[PDB]
Design a protein around this ligand. Structure first.
Ligand SMILES: *[C@H](C)[C@H]1/C(=C/c2[nH]c(/C=C3N=C(/C=C4\NC(=O)C(CC)=C4C)C(C)=C\3CCC(=O)O)c(CCC(=O)O)c2C)NC(=O)[C@@H]1C
Ligand SMILES: *[C@H](C)[C@H]1/C(=C/c2[nH]c(/C=C3N=C(/C=C4\NC(=O)C(CC)=C4C)C(C)=C\3CCC(=O)O)c(CCC(=O)O)c2C)NC(=O)[C@@H]1C
Ligand SMILES: *[C@H](C)[C@H]1/C(=C/c2[nH]c(/C=C3N=C(/C=C4\NC(=O)C(CC)=C4C)C(C)=C\3CCC(=O)O)c(CCC(=O)O)c2C)NC(=O)[C@@H]1C
Ligand SMILES: *[C@H](C)[C@H]1/C(=C/c2[nH]c(/C=C3N=C(/C=C4\NC(=O)C(CC)=C4C)C(C)=C\3CCC(=O)O)c(CCC(=O)O)c2C)NC(=O)[C@@H]1C
Ligand SMILES: *[C@H](C)[C@H]1/C(=C/c2[nH]c(/C=C3N=C(/C=C4\NC(=O)C(CC)=C4C)C(C)=C\3CCC(=O)O)c(CCC(=O)O)c2C)NC(=O)[C@@H]1C
Ligand SMILES: *[C@H](C)[C@H]1/C(=C/c2[nH]c(/C=C3N=C(/C=C4\NC(=O)C(CC)=C4C)C(C)=C\3CCC(=O)O)c(CCC(=O)O)c2C)NC(=O)[C@@H]1C
Ligand SMILES: *[C@H](C)[C@H]1/C(=C/c2[nH]c(/C=C3N=C(/C=C4\NC(=O)C(CC)=C4C)C(C)=C\3CCC(=O)O)c(CCC(=O)O)c2C)NC(=O)[C@@H]1C
Ligand SMILES: *[C@H](C)[C@H]1/C(=C/c2[nH]c(/C=C3N=C(/C=C4\NC(=O)C(CC)=C4C)C(C)=C\3CCC(=O)O)c(CCC(=O)O)c2C)NC(=O)[C@@H]1C
Ligand SMILES: *[C@H](C)[C@H]1/C(=C/c2[nH]c(/C=C3N=C(/C=C4\NC(=O)C(CC)=C4C)C(C)=C\3CCC(=O)O)c(CCC(=O)O)c2C)NC(=O)[C@@H]1C
Ligand SMILES: *[C@H](C)[C@H]1/C(=C/c2[nH]c(/C=C3N=C(/C=C4\NC(=O)C(CC)=C4C)C(C)=C\3CCC(=O)O)c(CCC(=O)O)c2C)NC(=O)[C@@H]1C
Ligand SMILES: *[C@H](C)[C@H]1/C(=C/c2[nH]c(/C=C3N=C(/C=C4\NC(=O)C(CC)=C4C)C(C)=C\3CCC(=O)O)c(CCC(=O)O)c2C)NC(=O)[C@@H]1C
Lengths: 172, 213, 162, 172, 162, 162, 172, 162, 172
């Protein structure tokens, strides 16, 4: 796979050089945040089921037709798929969040997804929507926990966002 | 009362660990993915070699470099890699030329599908196949067959399906595969004293149905 | 590339499940260690050169005949190479420390090591000495966990080479 | 595989002979009962879920220890297996019932079941018990349906029994 | 052995599911038909012999040279065999009717047909005539569905032979 | 989609053989039955609505608390849905009768049933009652084979749900 | 897969509706013809071997070159294939005929056929020809059987034709 | 059983390699965490009973109708069971904390959860409440990392149940 | 698999009870030693290659016949297998050492080994010897490291021994 650390390495390798002191300081800093980073992930995983459940409800309230005969989320079988998919995307996002890198998400998950959706006739727009719905709910938890030491998580929160968004974009 | 150590007091694992099937029972499945790290490739390769050759030891010279390269370019799937290994001098020398066709069939069954042979008819369709057409056509019929495709159809290394209930299983696979597996350090080996011999006794086959032909 | 973080992701991914507590625990481990690891890297990076000189040198003492004409150690080109190589080993060990896994080592150095060495008739032995000599020097500039880490990785190569 | 008809054939074959007129009359009458036969099967299949559910409850009321920590039906995973097994056996029995022959049941289902159970350490006796519990419940439905033309099903009912019993015996 | 009943069981079994309405419908079909099938069998069984004589005979008319010395049709042993064989075909077609599937025919006769015939130099053609001649006779003693059934099976062999 | 006709084709196709008598027998079965099946469908189709009302209703009697505020049965949206759903089940049952196989049911209703229900916290129980209540009503408008058929399919769902 | 019944269903489903009474009456009558339908199929299957044998003879009388060295039906190996193929197509056609729907034929059989033929260099024209030759012979049997109740099969006969023709067209 | 320690061994074993630095780092993580984990377990173990009572209770408040006659919550046997069950979940959660992995939970509780629950018509919902109520109580007796750990595991079940 | 922690759990489970306070204190203490434990493992892994190399030399100096034509370690192919076996055994031992439990070793490594050795004709006694030779060398490193904080490792050292010995015994 790849992640923040490995990445920097690779770059350095092609230059043929030891790591720049500047570059170390990226990683040094990254370490410091770890604890925050972790809790973020933990929050998602802990609430996973819910995140989805929630997002779905809202998705279907909005786009009533998806669940109507002839729509894409009908019948049961399809509905199931649609739920499953949402979850997957989430799963990956989390992965990325820990790694500190989009890659894993892009390569395993997003790559080719659009075209699939197209071929099937799945409306990419709606998919994207769902991803966002998820995003907001997820942040909700990341950002409002209980029994965690109070401090600033923004930096992480934004990175989280970005991941969700890469998803939204590539699907859309 | 409804909570109290039962008198048997066997563990969950217990039943597997007593048989020695603890690793194979719900075996882990190794899949090659669309873009693979250098480690995933090398895991898959190790898992194939271990499963096809029956945990027999493959030296550094025995390995087949080309098949592995093609697997690295993406030019062949894992299912094709399996066929290349199976259709190979090294496989043929271990499980085919020294044994009897009855012995080989049960081996290939185990190697390419973790079960043992379900009944006597399975020997008829695969022995006649071999006289009619090659070894090669026979081997293909295994990988080509729907059961290979339905499970581990593509990009998945074959894993033992024995020791877990599979739909349309015959009874008395469980016992049969226990004769074939015989523990994590055991390995079927062309080169043991008294040669290469069937473990599955032929009378237990007939114990499952035997139709005409 | 194999690092702690990548692995747990991989394992999680294979089973098709979310990262649960199990994996995070592991991750945490990697991060706590990093502080020591990172320190070690800063130390090697700085003294690189000096370590290299010393090593190359050593090898020649250990295997005098190499420097004789018609041998491999002989003539500057070869010496240059020999330097380069050891520097390559040195840079990659540092990468591993920082990455927090053998990954970098495995993929650059180890994979294909044997055959390369066979086809060009590089004797593993040599490299080994280089490393050992290094290990000895490092055993001064570092101390405690930082040291321990440095060793681990250095050794890992010794074992791979042998 | 085999069934009532095929069987009689095979017998005839070894004698080398055309079917006896007497023998035809076995099959002729067998046909006549078909309709009854079918409804019997239908009844089982229709009530399947229940049959099991029921039998299980009773099984566990009796042998409390199975569900106690350290017992064979504990923990969940084991319990699941045990339920699954019951179902399977049932499934086969039904098959037989339609075929009008034990064979199918004996070969795929029963043969080597005992040995499996032994190796695992699953107590064969209890298994057998479960099979009976099932039997009774099943007959219950076969014999007391709604909307079927009233008449005598005994003949079928007994044959049903036998199948269950072969099961019980060979497992035990 | 392939009969209606066996097949649906098989299919049900493979998928791992109970016999549901779908299959029973099919079964029902087999049973309803049986009455006609059974009738046909009683008719063939009775006239067996006569059909056989007529057939064997026919073959010779069709292929005079067979009866010449040094040929296959020649000398009683062979004639006896020829009779036997056709009787075997006759008994098995009857079995199929009753069983309500080609099953009996398939494994007993159709399986290995070719190779047997090749190794002993039995010409399919012959058998065929036998059958045809039969079919023609049967086309008198029977009528309606009973007839139709008889044909189906007789043909099934023609096709297998050719 | 699994119907009698599709299956025999499938089976024939797998072995790579022509449809022979065996399969046609089966087909015939499907067609003979149809007359009853079709009748049943006409009956359900007509009384649809009334059956639905009655069912939905029933459920509430059976599970009063559902209609309380803060529950699922509460507020019209939910009631509307509840209606819709039961109506869909009925439509598939009618479809199946006509198709002469569980096929339609399997693909629309059954496949993915569990997970849907889990994620939205629909309790199977409910549906079941609906069905049962239905079954009871149907047990008046129909009789003999037509009835029997209706039941089969209704049940098939009960079993799938439970 | 699909067939006449299933199809009508599917249509109905997308409208979201119970089947129209009108629509039932299509199926109701379709049933009535069953018996005819069946016999049709039976006739083909019964004569299969012959149908082909015949068609082939004629095909090769016409296009002598196919069987000449350098042609497409030479040598033996190729010839074999060519026969096999014809048969297959037939097999499918029959299937369709029973189903009362083209689908099965199109999806399993015709789909990809043309392209294959192209890649190999097999002359699609000739293939099509063979299909027709078959058609005529086949109808021959469907329409002139023995022991069948006399009546009008035209309706079925034409549908048969169509199937053959879809084949001819898509290959060609 | 999945714990940190078992996993790294497994991974090492698969690749066929010695435990190198990579894995040990991970292990270290597990051990450092343990101190907090262990603390949490001591706290749950002690208050067990009280937690259980409170939970069971809660469920009934949440779902009054359960206690009515003819329901599941009704009659002591059932209540006893209900108690038992919740206690098992707690025991596995404590086991997990100590083992330092979800393992114990997965193998005892989670695997086969669905089908058990389906066949006996246990509504996941119930359990969930139990857990939640627990979580709330635990949210007093514990604090900081110890707490965090307790949560993780409790949740893990919620997610599995739902 | 299993390890020290998991094990204690399992025991507790069969009693049906929460963990005894006494029992916790076993695990609590076990944790404390971790650091020592780890370094032990590290020492083996670090020296692996050599450990084997060494043991082998000695093994072959002693049992000259193994390397003679007709012996078990001749020719090359066989020799290679024997080295490789030694490595595998070692590898496992290490694993155990970390786990704090024999199991892993017994199940994956030792299980079936004797019988294999028998079938091959490999002389079990010699195998056992090799295992010991390894043991001694290994302990050598575990017990005499450099740059580690000085303290007492005996406890670990002995447990190490035991593992080696279980190996020796089961093979022999
Ligand atoms: C961020 C979204 C929210 C937030 C985070 C936050 N966390 C900490 C500190 C810690 N959090 C953890 C978490 C873990 N470390 C691990 O190893 C694991 C896996 C087992 C977890 C779950 C830890 C251990 C710490 C340190 C000690 C502590 O008591 O927290 C902080 C404090 C700053 C720091 O980086 O240490 C913060 C701010 N707090 C919020 O309110 C944000 C919404
Ligand atoms: C130093 C101990 C001895 C020595 C070295 C020497 N090396 C080569 C050639 C090669 N060295 C390497 C090694 C690496 N290249 C890599 O990319 C990596 C991994 C990133 C390593 C470790 C390689 C690959 C080569 C071959 C390619 C090349 O020739 O450049 C030589 C050349 C030998 C020859 O016959 O050409 C030499 C001499 N010489 C000394 O002084 C020491 C004895
Ligand atoms: C339930 C009534 C009783 C029970 C059952 C039970 N079975 C297992 C495990 C297995 N059951 C089977 C059985 C089958 N294999 C087959 O082929 C067939 C039909 C031919 C059956 C019925 C198998 C193979 C297993 C092992 C693999 C698997 O899990 O699928 C268990 C679990 C024991 C274990 O450790 O695996 C149990 C509990 N035992 C009881 O306590 C009940 C009385
Ligand atoms: C026996 C356990 C019970 C019983 C049965 C019974 N059934 C009939 C008659 C019929 N039953 C069926 C049922 C089917 N035929 C089929 O083709 C299918 C599959 C789609 C089924 C389910 C049919 C059609 C008949 C004929 C018409 C009818 O309903 O009667 C009888 C009557 C006697 C007979 O020989 O037909 C009986 C007695 N009656 C019992 O006592 C039990 C309740
Ligand atoms: C009749 C048209 C011609 C003929 C027949 C004839 N048959 C044989 C030899 C065999 N006949 C069969 C056929 C069957 N045996 C079976 O088991 C079955 C399936 C139930 C069939 C159809 C067999 C197998 C043999 C070969 C061995 C044997 O002796 O049974 C012969 C003898 C040929 C020989 O000995 O090489 C003959 C002549 N005889 C005629 O007059 C017709 C030309
Ligand atoms: C009726 C007995 C109870 C009830 C049910 C109810 N259902 C939902 C939501 C859904 N129900 C279904 C069911 C289906 N949708 C399909 O596509 C099919 C196959 C044709 C079925 C059977 C689905 C998928 C949903 C989810 C989303 C949707 O909009 O349909 C609800 C709403 C719950 C929610 O959170 O959305 C309810 C309440 N309503 C009642 O009054 C009874 C208690
Ligand atoms: C015969 C009328 C004509 C003819 C046929 C022909 N076909 C091949 C080879 C192939 N034909 C097929 C056919 C199919 N592919 C499919 O998917 C289907 C439907 C499901 C069919 C029927 C295929 C796959 C092959 C290639 C593989 C094979 O072994 O058959 C040949 C031989 C081509 C060659 O060069 O080997 C021929 C001759 N060609 C003629 O000359 C006739 C006009
Ligand atoms: C049409 C090409 C030719 C034709 C057909 C025809 N058939 C019937 C009637 C029947 N044919 C069958 C045949 C079967 N039914 C089955 O279940 C099976 C499978 C085992 C077969 C083969 C049956 C049973 C009938 C009903 C009774 C009968 O044979 O009469 C008719 C009569 C009209 C009707 O719709 O019933 C006709 C016209 N006859 C021709 O003239 C065409 C050449
Ligand atoms: C409590 C929230 C509600 C309740 C529950 C209840 N459960 C059962 C029966 C079982 N529950 C389980 C669950 C488990 N058993 C295990 O071994 C494990 C893993 C350790 C779990 C989680 C099982 C397996 C059973 C079935 C076996 C048995 O009979 O014990 C019942 C009785 C069900 C019945 O139909 O008899 C009940 C009532 N009780 C309440 O009051 C709440 C509504
Ligand atoms: C070396 C110390 C001594 C020795 C060993 C030896 N072993 C073999 C052959 C095999 N050894 C094994 C064993 C294992 N497979 C495993 O996975 C494990 C660990 C889980 C072991 C330990 C196997 C399976 C074989 C067969 C390999 C194959 O078939 O390729 C040999 C070679 C014997 C032969 O004829 O192949 C030897 C020599 N024997 C000695 O003499 C040493 C004292
Ligand atoms: C025992 C065989 C020999 C020995 C060991 C020893 N080690 C320590 C202490 C530590 N060793 C480590 C090592 C690690 N911790 C990790 O996280 C990892 C993997 C990344 C390793 C390799 C650490 C961190 C410590 C703590 C600090 C330190 O090293 O001093 C001790 C001290 C006792 C204690 O920590 O409780 C001892 C005794 N020392 C010997 O001389 C033995 C032969």
């Amino acid at each position: 796979m790849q992640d923040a650390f490995t990445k920097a390495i690779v770059a350095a390798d092609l230059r043929g050089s030891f790591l720049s002191e500047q570059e170390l300081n990226q990683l040094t800093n990254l370490v410091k945040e770890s604890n925050k980073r972790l809790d973020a992930v933990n929050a998602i995983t802990g609430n996973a089921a819910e995140i989805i459940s929630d997002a779905a409800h809202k998705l279907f309230a909005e786009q009533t037709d998806l669940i109507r005969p002839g729509g894409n989320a009908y019948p049961n079988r399809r509905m199931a798929a649609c739920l499953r998919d949402m979850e997957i995307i989430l799963r990956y996002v989390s992965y990325a969040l820990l790694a500190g890198d989009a890659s894993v998400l892009e390569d395993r998950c997003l790559n080719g997804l659009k075209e699939t959706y197209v071929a099937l006739g799945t409306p990419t727009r709606s998919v994207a929507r769902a991803v966002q719905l998820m995003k907001e709910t997820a942040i909700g938890y990341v950002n409002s926990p209980s029994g965690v030491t109070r401090g600033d998580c923004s930096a992480l929160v934004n990175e989280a966002a970005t991941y969700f968004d890469k998803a939204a974009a590539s699907i859309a | 009362y409804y909570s109290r150590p039962a008198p048997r007091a066997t563990a969950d694992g217990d039943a597997q660990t007593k048989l020695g099937i603890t690793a194979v029972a719900p075996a882990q499945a190794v899949e090659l993915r669309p873009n693979f790290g250098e480690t995933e490739l090398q895991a898959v390769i190790r898992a194939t070699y271990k499963q096809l050759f029956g945990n027999t030891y493959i030296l550094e010279a025995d390995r087949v470099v080309q098949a592995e390269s093609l697997l690295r370019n993406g030019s062949i799937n894992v299912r094709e890699f399996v066929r290349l290994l199976a259709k190979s001098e090294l496989y043929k020398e271990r499980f085919f030329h020294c044994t009897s066709n009855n012995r080989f069939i049960e081996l290939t069954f185990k190697h390419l599908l973790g079960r043992a042979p379900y009944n006597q008819s399975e020997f008829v369709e695969h022995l006649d196949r071999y006289q009619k057409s090659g070894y090669d056509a026979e081997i293909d019929s295994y990988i080509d067959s729907d059961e290979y495709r339905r499970v581990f159809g593509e990009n998945t290394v074959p894993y033992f399906r024995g020791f877990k209930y599979q739909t349309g299983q015959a009874a008395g696979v469980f016992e049969r595969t226990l004769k074939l597996y015989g523990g994590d350090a055991d390995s079927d080996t062309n080169r043991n004293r008294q040669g290469q011999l069937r473990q599955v006794d032929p009378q237990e086959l007939l114990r499952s149905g035997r139709g005409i032909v | 590339m194999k690092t702690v973080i990548t692995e747990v992701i991989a394992s999680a991914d294979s089973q098709g499940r979310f990262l649960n507590n199990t994996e995070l625990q592991a991750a945490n481990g990697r991060f706590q260690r990093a502080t020591a690891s990172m320190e070690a890297a800063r130390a090697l990076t700085s003294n690189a050169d000096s370590l290299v000189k010393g090593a190359v040198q050593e090898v020649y003492n250990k295997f005098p005949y190499l420097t004789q004409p018609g041998q491999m150690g002989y003539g500057d080109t070869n010496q240059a190479k020999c330097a380069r190589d050891i520097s390559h080993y040195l840079r990659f060990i540092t990468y591993s420390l920082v990455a927090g896994g053998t990954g970098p080592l495995d993929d650059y150095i180890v994979a294909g090591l044997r055959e390369v060495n066979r086809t060009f008739n590089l004797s593993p032995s040599w490299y080994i000495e280089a490393l050992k000599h290094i290990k000895g020097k490092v055993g001064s500039q570092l101390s405690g966990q930082p040291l321990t880490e440095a060793n681990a990785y250095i050794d890992y190569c010794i074992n791979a080479l042998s």
